[PDB]
Design a protein around this ligand. Structure first.
Ligand SMILES: [Xe]
Length: 275
């Protein structure tokens, strides 16, 4: 169980929980970043793949964890500050950040603020690279609505599961996210909607980094050729960008193909170790 490595510390004004396996090994540390309205539990299978060979840190955001709570409004900028304060307390210098879906807003901002010495590379998992399509835009609006947020979550679950009876992913969505409420989901809708509005898209944000550096997008969904093409076109244009289609069933490769996620993370960690 990953609750063996679970800690809690005061980060500015808020008590945050975090995973830290405290492995005595060569860097970089692997910094696993949750998306919105879930926690380290998403990474329990991936932690198992990496545990022996890497120091593994998983911050939980304000109001997130085994016992969710209401907190004052914050966004991805604050997530960045919280992450860096945790790393500072732990004495971690070099790290490889790895995000799930909209944890990517945090990862890209973290690359900017931490710089390429501390954060030389990044891995983004299953993160919608294009601007919101009508269906996704509709989901965000429902999440923001105090009357319809739960309907919003159900619609997203349908999409993420993509018609698969995936035991582990279902357990995560239906049990491990069950305690999260409008305070989180509405916030996630406001933050993500604004992130797209202000930064245009994940691809725009990444291209606008002061110091571009190796980033790989590893994803299972969406499955359509048109999505593969935008990743391929971006990779043609930018030497520092690469991708891999993982062929996993759901939006949660960290859960359904953790072995595959781990080989990409290991490749990037090895590259860092060698200069
Ligand atoms: Xe979302």
């Amino acid at each position: 169980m990953t609750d063996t490595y679970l800690h809690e510390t005061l980060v500015f004004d808020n008590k945050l929980s975090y995973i830290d396996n405290q492995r005595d090994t060569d860097g970089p540390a692997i910094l696993l970043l949750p998306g919105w309205c879930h926690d380290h539990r998403v990474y329990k299978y991936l932690i198992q793949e990496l545990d022996a060979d890497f120091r593994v840190i998983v911050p939980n955001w304000r109001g997130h964890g085994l016992s969710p709570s209401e907190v004052p409004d914050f966004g991805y900028q604050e997530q960045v500050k919280d992450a860096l304060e945790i790393l500072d307390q732990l004495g971690v210098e070099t790290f490889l950040p790895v995000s799930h879906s909209h944890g990517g807003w945090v990862l890209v901002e973290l690359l900017e603020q931490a710089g390429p010495e501390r954060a030389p590379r990044g891995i983004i998992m299953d993160w919608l690279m294009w601007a919101p399509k009508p269906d996704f835009a509709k989901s965000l609006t429902l999440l923001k609505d105090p009357e319809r947020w739960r309907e919003g979550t159900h619609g997203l679950f349908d999409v993420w599961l993509d018609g698969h009876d995936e035991k582990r992913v279902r357990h995560h969505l239906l049990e491990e996210m069950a305690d999260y409420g409008y305070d989180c989901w509405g916030r996630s809708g406001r933050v993500i909607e604004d992130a797209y509005g202000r930064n245009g898209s994940p691809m725009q944000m990444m291209a606008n980094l002061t110091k571009t550096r190796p980033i790989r997008h590893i994803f299972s969904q969406p499955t359509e050729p048109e999505y593969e093409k935008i990743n391929s076109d971006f990779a043609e244009q930018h030497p520092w960008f690469s991708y891999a289609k993982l062929g996993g069933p759901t939006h949660f490769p960290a859960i359904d193909v953790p072995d595959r996620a781990a080989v990409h993370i290991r490749e990037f960690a090895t590259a860092i170790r060698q200069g």
